[PDB]
Ligand binder design. Structure first.
Ligand SMILES: [Cl-]
Ligand SMILES: [Cl-]
Length: 163
């Protein structure tokens, strides 16, 4: 576990993380895909061997000794708001189980279902709150990765409001 488990946020490419494992915003088929998933495929392509897994689940594949946790959020273009919300909460619960099983002291996480899978809605609060629900009981240092300055600002505010 980390000495004083914490949440942080960084505005940079998750493929350049400084943590002991990474969470991929995966597609269910294990394809190279787009956005975070494509960056993860270019950095850790060996981790896409038999990485296909259903919506709401997480599947870990090693790249060397570095764990890639493929977490499949719902595409809100396809799911109802209600069913999508359930599957998004479930994907993060499965990430917490994998982080625990691996024994890592830190994990790099993106906000699931906030990009290509957002159905064109702002889902920062919805996705972050489900990340907290799952990860609050874990002792790994969590570092959230984002792209946009206004996302960094709001994520940082949400973290600090609990401290
Ligand atoms: Cl970067
Ligand atoms: Cl997404």
């Amino acid at each position: 576990g980390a000495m004083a488990p914490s949440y942080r946020v960084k505005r940079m490419d998750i493929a350049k993380n400084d943590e002991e494992c990474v969470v991929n915003a995966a597609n269910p088929r294990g394809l190279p895909g787009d956005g975070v998933c494509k960056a993860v495929y270019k950095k850790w392509p060996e981790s896409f061997k038999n990485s296909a897994t259903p919506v709401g689940t997480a599947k870990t594949v090693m790249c060397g000794t570095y764990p890639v946790i493929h977490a499949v959020g719902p595409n809100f273009s396809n799911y109802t708001e209600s069913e999508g919300d359930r599957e998004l909460a479930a994907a993060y619960r499965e990430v917490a189980k994998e982080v625990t099983r691996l024994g890592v002291n830190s994990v790099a996480i993106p906000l699931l279902s906030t990009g290509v899978y957002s159905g064109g809605k702002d889902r920062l609060t919805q996705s972050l709150n489900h990340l907290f629900t799952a990860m609050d009981s874990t002792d790994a240092d969590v570092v959230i990765y984002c792209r946009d300055k206004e996302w960094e600002k709001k994520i940082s505010e949400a973290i600090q409001m609990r401290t």
